[PDB]
């Protein structure tokens, strides 16, 4: 019954906006830390943003600080990632993960492409 | 004359998360350990450096009762010379530990429909705990090269993590209340004794 589902994404240009949503089932998303990851085709996976359990803060990579903002909707059991001022290097597939540390039993991704002009 | 208040420890209403284990010291009283073995059907009732049958014959200067809640999977770590997140970061017993580990399954009390996430355990620490150390610090853990004191990068984690106790979980994931009686024996006179 446990799963995470990524939605949103697509094609936008340098300077554009986008919002990805990660819809979780089988657990409340505020009890553990939630994370957003991305992987450009050549490069390795990179951690972009994370929101800790309850109100214990937010974490942003230097790559995207001040441009991306992660947020949590307890009613929709969904973690959102708002992406503003997008630069061509932000092209990747975007994954969300739960830092459950084995308190679960669950253990697809969405594509974002941002052009130059 | 006076019987040691074991009911205050084993029969307590609330229990502490393992990272913030509660300790109550026992002295100036008398303890029957056979009455407490059968007091309730316990999941685990084992001892180190002493043996359960002889327990009433011994006599100690002080006895410390430590209580907390962990998974059933992690009762194995409540033992001398064990490795794991609970023993490394939450509750460490010394290699020369003399005392007893008592635990029982508490799914009926500590689990709840929709999950109970009130119990916590420390997930990260820069060091392994020293015996009977108790760290209840909340300060951001930095994992890796990039610092996080104010930078708030990705690789910086809130140290405590919640257990997820569902009633339908497997037995290993189910909550267990644990009591550890450490038998301190000193050069000063004894205060707690069997009949
Ligand atoms: C832990 O408690 C149980 C019973 O729970 C309560 O505690 C008792 C003090 C009393 O208020 C009971 O009515 C409550 O239900 C204890 O088991 C009882 O032990 C007493 C000892 O005098 C006995 O009279 C009762 O018949 C027992 N009842 C049952 C259901 O077993 C138990 O001994 C307590 N553990 C301790 C004190 O270490």
Numbering used by the authors:
A (entry chain A): 1 to 107, 113 to 122
B (entry chain B): 333 to 527
Publication text:
The causative agent, severe acute respiratory syndrome coronavirus 2 (SARS-CoV-2), uses its Spike protein (S) to recognize receptors on host cells, an initial step for viral infection. Here we report the rapid selection of synthetic antibodies (sybodies)24 in vitro using RBD as the bait.
The optimal construct for MR17m-MR17m had the shortest linker (13 GS).
